[PDB]
Design a protein around this ligand. Structure first.
Ligand SMILES: OC[C@H]1O[C@@H](O)[C@H](O)[C@@H](O)[C@H]1O
Ligand SMILES: OC[C@H]1O[C@@H](O)[C@H](O)[C@@H](O)[C@H]1O
Ligand SMILES: OC[C@H]1O[C@@H](O)[C@H](O)[C@@H](O)[C@H]1O
Ligand SMILES: OC[C@H]1O[C@@H](O)[C@H](O)[C@@H](O)[C@H]1O
Ligand code: NA
Ligand code: NA
Ligand code: NA
Ligand code: NA
Lengths: 989, 989
């Protein structure tokens, strides 16, 4: 019969399996002297909820615009009130039935008027560097075409459509399209024209495309240069000038430069070049380097390299997918400042401006195509576009555009087909296309472990153990003997490892030792550089980051998008401070006798001439000595023993026994670089003269007994509970055993393997670890010394409904000045619950004091937190921080702020100071309780209550990376056990 | 050394394994002419948080009372502001380490001054009928003793301690003691002196104990009477008078009464008797009945009986464990009014006054000892007191006191050792003790399935299938051949079945048919009679019930305590209305031709003389005919065919085809009974002349097309969505498919068996059933009739991230007056998620109307809700209720209120009325959405939004009893399938 539905045609276009239509051939992004006009600025924007109600009212013509309001472009429009951001990880936010699209599909109509001078005639084009996800483009009312591939560039010919003077550009953007099925990255869904829009003139006798080939003969030191130039796809005559190298050559001819300085992330040497035809000149930066796979090793310029990498998404906490250039420059500088040398453009090509910065600052780049079909996995990959022939042209297009845009950049050392897209015919087609087009760069793809269509073997989150087996070449064989032979000849990369969500990542050091030991291991890229937090405010206007669910999403994945080394505003997390140290390119081992240090240059190409080597001896009262020592340049992968000045060793010999002192040797920048100023720290090592264990105070002065209180020097006990009620005028509200901490994001993740896959957080809750109860068994005084008396308080700790417990005995002693506390812990019964062994977070004490703390000082590791499998970046020394600065501003509050390896601590409580000494303990000080910390979903929920929560831990569990990847390694697990530890306390007024 | 802890002695007493000390021998509760004074009234009360701080300040003497305030006694003191109620099911609220007690142990000091006249001298006693959990008792400063067994009676001799005139009674009650380990019932923890306190004189030549033996010879009709009387444990001479039977006999001699009328729950004949010694007379009610197990059947007075039972806890929503006498009488009347004939005193003996009411109203009683160790189960029963020899005397005591108190009551037909206490030596000792003491009553205990120490085979929540196998005697054998032979000779009882939590219970009819078919099946007792809800109010003072967690509990079990047939205030839930019908003691099957009905007397002893048999024919406009028919008494377990007056059949023959009419036959009380008034309904049956399927309207008048709307008679469609936007001026805000409902408590329970034990609620959430999305595929008009046109709207329904869907096509038609809606549903793809088949809650439509509804009327089943496996109590007829009265006030809001079997419906929306007809559909009407219903944890969270949510379901799932016991039976499950159904709509103004 009849057909009455609306918008069927717009929707049928959105449901297209094809690439964009009407676009010029894909080419490089080129700096050209051709006239250009940026259309970035204030556009007009109208939002309709779906195609069926998007007006077809000739709005493209620019006149009589009702419903339109101002909107900046580039933009991610949900970041400007229009709709809301939405976060899913794997799950699609719409029903999975490709190529169909939901009825709720935000449609954004963009319109801008601009002036086209005569220099854009006769020929010109319009360039869009990114539209998420489907663009339709009209100029002065005529349709130029459509765009597909949200992070890829499209160029449309406007010759004979651009009119001199006023022009009107109209763009209809659909959030969802068939392309959404192939853009399922773990990140926010954010439609918009989110990258540059540019009018460019195309002069006659110009240059459309250039393909730089710049190799390096590491034996002769020769460069191998060929620069290809074309117009309309055909090779053209052009001249290539490289002044610094005294070169003038024809485009299209290979020459041998007698001697070039080769490009690497370490020494990113770049030669300025120009490719000139009659009507247009293109300016290039040329880095001479050759990539090769040899002996199951990934080599640049003849050397195996070590990738110290991160996964870099593009995200801004207020602008969405638009990352301003000053943020890009700052964050790339920040990466270099933390010894990073490699970037994976997870999981799509970056802004085109990124590539020149990577060339200049020096990163080995894995440039990744915009392709991810992860949400088909949950259905056994049924309908996976990667293996559906109908999607072949769309996916080859995506790969073509990815390669063509960035093929001229030395920093790109690998092409990646995409991410988490399964296996399939279209991936093979993308590989063959890339391999034919650009043999000079190995192909990467992790989704197909057989590695049939790639040149490197890539995995995500392989455990340290499996990595060690791969490093030795003894991983299990593939069933296919041919494929196994190929894959065993491949070097191995962790495209994602040590997931950096919340407190953590743990186990980074164990990976690094393998990277150093085994040449086949190329290194690894941390998942991920940044947290995708989005700024939002509450009533009082206090700012904080939002995550999945905080924007009304029907389906989401919560804080899983906040999984980074820096926050959305690029403030480092402790994991980055640790990472910087783990990947430091020099190793400095200070001799115990302070006569010198062993120095190993862990770089691949550079020597140590860029570094100044500094030493300082610090003591309780500050610096005793310091200076700089001169070090003959150490070659890459070599080592030497540097003598320290004799005054240092002599100072060590003169220290009275038990006086703590720390010798630190640092390698800093001898001069300003392009990524940091002179004096910036790159590497360091220490040797510590530990303080002698604190003398327990003689048990002098007998305990005083009263009706309800007991008194032992400065300590007052409740005779009912047997617990201290004040120490030296400091009110104590509670003292008890701790075995639990507020779960980290890692603790909320499933630990696969074994019959028990409950997250540790759930194991703890089931076991009652968060709700310990204490029963008093007895209190007794015993002869001490010369009248004095110790006080022993015996308790048992358990939880409601459990038969297992620990016996905890506190023996107190005092000489009137310092208080001696010995704690003994003994397992009672079998610590099994729900059929599995219970594990502990800690063995420690919680002191709850009835006064606030202004300042915390300690001798130990710092300044930032450290847990058994983290804190590589925490060095030995003396530290002091205001209470608030002891905390860590994770988006979801969780256990954090512990300072492991403390020998002494001092809390300033108003006018008094509480001092704690003893054998190594971890230190934590909070203005709120653990229950307040666990309950909080965002930082504003953390309310101070005027108390001080002081945690002193004899033992801590590790933090691992169980949110995604390995849990805590065996050596850092904490099974129930017996324990004993001494402390001394003292209050100064 | 020294020992400084406080309260060690009080705590060591609380940790005692022994029974109470200093108490008189256990005896019956006896109505005596001895002087008595109740000390119930306003006592003084002081609360301390534990033994170590409970003052030892001579408070027992009554002078200088600081910290004391007024408190009524009996009381559960947390119900009066002192502390808070706390609910755990299985889990103990304290660490499990018997006999030890937590430091947080509320200690309640009770004190009262009273006057003792001379009639309490020389000898007297003090009687406590219940103290939870540990009592210490002083009178005028001297310690009488202690109490253990919280629901058991203790009596202390006060001779020479009671002083003439003023006396001061002091009682220190500890909430927790070693006894708590054996009182772990699924209920609130509520300390207090919660039952009577009584001063009783003990005259010389009195009677301390009496033991009535009153058997019945069902062959001769003789009574067998022996009344034992004792003083100080020794048999004494007394005279027994039974006037009605012309008997005067000696105590201690067995006589044969020539003819007695025997006692049963159906005919609770009681003979008044007095047992008199010189100094005291005891008044008794004697019911002659004999209990016997024969041929694997439980028989009373020579007949197998059917138990129609409930589990009766003692709970009051504002007074806790104190249940006022008028509530006890009312609720027992209410039970009889719903055909219940049996009570299990779950899981402790009731108030002593209960036993006379049960004798008088008529219930077969399972009287259960106060014993439950359920919380040791989770540890493999390690340390279970039931098998720990140190607990033998305490547990034998409990059983002794239980039996001695109530052994004289005919209503007690079984003794139960306790509940969920595992297996063990002490249970065997309790059984042997009871068996020696009172052979006249079989022993019940469910915890030991081997049944070694019991006389009946008892289970909880055995499935209908397993019950059928037990009923046939073909359940699997025990390993022990001797024990198997014993158990197979036992009749079988479900001490708990068809858990009545929230919407439900389902599957009651399938159990009942087995009880009727198989003599070995004794029947069953529903878990439980009442919800243990506790009254609380919010800001505006609106009252509602609280459950676990609503009182600050650290560990609890939420609404699992609200699992009853009536609410805390004894308002019936729909499950009780269904239960009443399922267990109705007469079966009335009305003949299709309306000539008569088959009547089966399902009683065990009584005939049908107590019933008046009434008929009524009702039609659309009300009653057409009615009257009473006389029925010659039908013997128990017999049946007959009763003719109806010829006018009834003739009326059926005269009905024009399609005119609905309902013949109902009811058996009501011919005269007032002791539990209801004359006319009270006991049983009923119906025969319905169904209305003819509604004629679909001729598809006349063609559909009108506009830019954004389509019009088809009274219906206006949105051309974008293709859905109605108004019908006859009634705004329609949404129309779509439903497959999901707000989970019931049953849906939140694990369905054991199979690899999938996710609750159904979780299966639905994982599957996206609660978040369906609809895509429009096409809208088309088609030739109807004489110009007219149908309108077909094709849609697909799925959910985000899922590949499965349903195709839903709506074909609309109208003649200008009525609207015809045909809906077609077709499965698209395989409905599997997380590896398991998805099940649906329903196949229906949700109409969301933009106006409120005042009234709902329908022809179908009613007046209360009905689901496929419930609604036995809903009868056919015409019903009309205000919107609010369509809802069901479950404590936790959940799916409820559906009216299955509807043929027509009418919603009054202000001035207009919306009418729905069609083949059988279920009807639900709410002022709030399903998401609001699912989110709500208490009724105050249900906010009306001014809309009407109308649900019309072609198919519904059952509700089952999966919260505890069987899920939905196979025949009521709802697997994805294709479906089609027609409806007609019409708006009257
Ligand atoms: O012009 C349409 C097509 O032209 C091809 O030559 C080119 O490889 C593609 O980039 C595509 O855009
Ligand atoms: O390419 C084959 C691989 O595919 C992955 O998706 C899978 O998780 C691996 O176990 C491996 O089989
Ligand atoms: O008087 C103490 C004991 O006396 C026994 O004769 C009696 O069986 C028990 O009830 C117990 O109370
Ligand atoms: O008495 C033996 C029984 O004990 C129960 O606790 C158990 O759940 C049953 O499976 C049965 O073994
Ligand atoms: Na992914
Ligand atoms: Na938290
Ligand atoms: Na229980
Ligand atoms: Na709910």
């Amino acid at each position: 019969g009849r057909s009455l539905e609306l918008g069927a045609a717009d929707i049928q276009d959105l449901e297209s399996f094809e690439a964009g239509r009407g676009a010029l051939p894909a080419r490089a992004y080129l700096q050209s002297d051709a006239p250009r006009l940026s259309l970035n600025g204030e556009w007009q924007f109208r939002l309709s909820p779906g195609s069926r109600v998007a007006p077809d009212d000739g709005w493209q013509l620019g006149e009589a615009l009702n419903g339109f309001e101002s909107l900046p472009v580039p933009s991610s429009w949900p970041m400007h009130g229009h709709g809301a951001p939405a976060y899913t990880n794997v799950q699609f936010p719409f029903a999975v039935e490709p190529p169909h699209v939901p009825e709720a599909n935000p449609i954004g109509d963009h319109l801008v008027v601009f002036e086209a001078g005569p220099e854009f005639f006769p020929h010109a084009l319009l360039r869009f560097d990114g539209i998420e996800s489907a663009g339709t483009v009209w100029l002065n009312g005529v349709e130029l075409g459509t765009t597909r591939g949200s992070r890829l560039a499209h160029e449309f010919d406007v010759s004979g459509i651009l009119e001199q003077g006023e022009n009107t550009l109209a763009v209809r953007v659909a959030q969802f399209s068939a392309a959404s099925y192939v853009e399922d990255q773990d990140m926010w869904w954010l439609p918009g024209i989110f990258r540059d829009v540019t009018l460019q003139a195309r002069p006659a006798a110009g240059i459309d495309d250039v393909f730089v080939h710049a190799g390096y003969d590491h034996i002769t030191g020769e460069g191998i240069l060929k620069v290809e130039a074309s117009r309309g796809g055909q090779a053209i005559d052009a001249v290539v000038r490289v002044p610094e190298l005294a070169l003038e050559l024809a485009a299209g001819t290979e020459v041998r430069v007698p001697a070039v300085e080769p490009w690497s992330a370490e020494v990113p040497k770049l030669y300025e070049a120009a490719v000139s035809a009659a009507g247009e000149s293109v300016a290039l930066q040329i880095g001479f380097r050759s990539i090769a796979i040899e002996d199951a090793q990934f080599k640049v310029n003849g050397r195996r390299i070590l990738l110290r990498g991160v996964n870099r998404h593009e995200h801004h906490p207020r602008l969405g997918r638009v990352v301003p250039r000053d943020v890009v420059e700052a964050e790339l500088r920040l990466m270099k400042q933390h010894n990073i040398n490699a970037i994976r453009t997870s999981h799509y090509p970056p802004h085109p401006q990124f590539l020149a910065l990577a060339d200049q600052l020096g990163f080995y780049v894995v440039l990744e195509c915009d392709l991810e079909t992860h949400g088909f996995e949950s259905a056994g990959w049924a309908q996976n576009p990667s293996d559906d022939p109908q999607w072949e042209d769309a996916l080859v297009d995506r790969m073509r555009r990815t390669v063509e845009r960035d093929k001229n950049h030395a920093s790109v050392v690998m092409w990646s087909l995409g991410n988490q897209a399964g296996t399939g015919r279209n991936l093979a087609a993308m590989s063959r296309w890339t391999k034919d087009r650009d043999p000079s760069r190995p192909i990467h793809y992790e989704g197909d472990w057989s590695s049939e269509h790639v040149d490197v073997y890539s995995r995500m989150y392989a455990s340290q153990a499996e990595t060690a087996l791969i490093g030795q070449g003894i991983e299990p064989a593939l069933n296919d003997a041919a494929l196994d032979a190929r894959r065993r000849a491949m070097p191995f990369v962790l495209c994602e490892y040590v997931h950096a969500m919340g407190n953590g990542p743990g186990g980074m050091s164990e990976y690094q030792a393998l990277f150093e030991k085994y040449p086949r291991l190329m290194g690894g890229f941390v998942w991920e550089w940044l947290e995708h937090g989005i700024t939002v405010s509450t009533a009082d206007g206090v700012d904080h980051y939002g995550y999945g669910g905080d924007f009304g999403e029907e389906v989401h994945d919560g804080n899983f998008v906040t999984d980074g080394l820096v926050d959305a505003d690029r403030r480092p997390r402790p994991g980055l401070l640790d990472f910087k140290k783990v990947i430091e390119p020099l190793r400095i081992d200070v001799a115990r006798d302070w006569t010198g240090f062993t120095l190993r240059n862990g770089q691949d190409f550079a020597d140590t001439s860029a570094f100044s080597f500094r030493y300082e001896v610090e003591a309780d009262g500050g610096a005793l000595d310091g200076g700089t020592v001169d070090v003959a340049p150490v070659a890459p992968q070599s080592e030497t023993v540097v003598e320290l000045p004799g005054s240092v060793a002599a100072l060590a010999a003169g220290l009275s026994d038990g006086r703590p002192a720390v010798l630190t040797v640092r390698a800093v920048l001898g001069a300003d670089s392009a990524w940091a100023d002179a004096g910036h720290e790159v590497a360091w090592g220490q040797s510590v003269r530990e303080p002698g264990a604190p003398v327990p105070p003689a048990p002098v002065e007998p305990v005083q007994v009263q009706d309800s209180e007991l008194t032992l020097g400065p300590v007052v006990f409740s005779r009912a509970t047997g617990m201290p009620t004040s120490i030296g005028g400091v009110p104590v509200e509670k003292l008890g055993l701790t075995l639990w901490w507020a779960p980290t994001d890692n603790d909320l993740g499933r630990e696969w393997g074994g019959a028990d896959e409950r997250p540790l957080a759930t194991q703890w809750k089931d076991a009652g670890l968060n709700r310990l109860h204490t029963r008093l068994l007895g209190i007794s005084a015993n002869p001490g010394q010369d009248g004095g008396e110790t006080l022993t308080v015996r308790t048992r700790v358990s939880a409601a409904d459990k038969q297992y417990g620990v016996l905890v005995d506190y023996t107190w002693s005092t000489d009137g000045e310092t208080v001696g506390l010995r704690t003994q812990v003994r397992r009672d019964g079998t610590w099994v619950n729900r059929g599995f062994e219970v594990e502990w977070a800690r063995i420690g004490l919680e002191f709850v004091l009835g006064e606030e703390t202004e300042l915390v000082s300690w001798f130990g590791q710092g300044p930032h937190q450290s847990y058994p499998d983290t804190g590589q970046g925490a060095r030995a020394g003396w530290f002091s921080l205001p209470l608030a600065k002891m905390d860590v501003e994770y988006v979801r509050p969780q256990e954090c702020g512990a300072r492991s390896g403390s020998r002494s601590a001092a809390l300033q409580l108003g006018g008094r100071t509480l001092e704690i000494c003893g054998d190594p303990f971890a230190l934590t000080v909070r203005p709120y309780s653990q229950d307040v910390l666990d309950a909080a979903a965002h930082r504003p929920d953390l309310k101070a209550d005027g108390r001080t929560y002081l945690y002193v831990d004899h033992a801590l569990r590790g933090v691992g990376t169980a949110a995604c990847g390995p849990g805590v390694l065996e050596q850092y697990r904490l099974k129930p056990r017996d324990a004993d530890f001494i402390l001394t306390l003292k209050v100064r007024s």
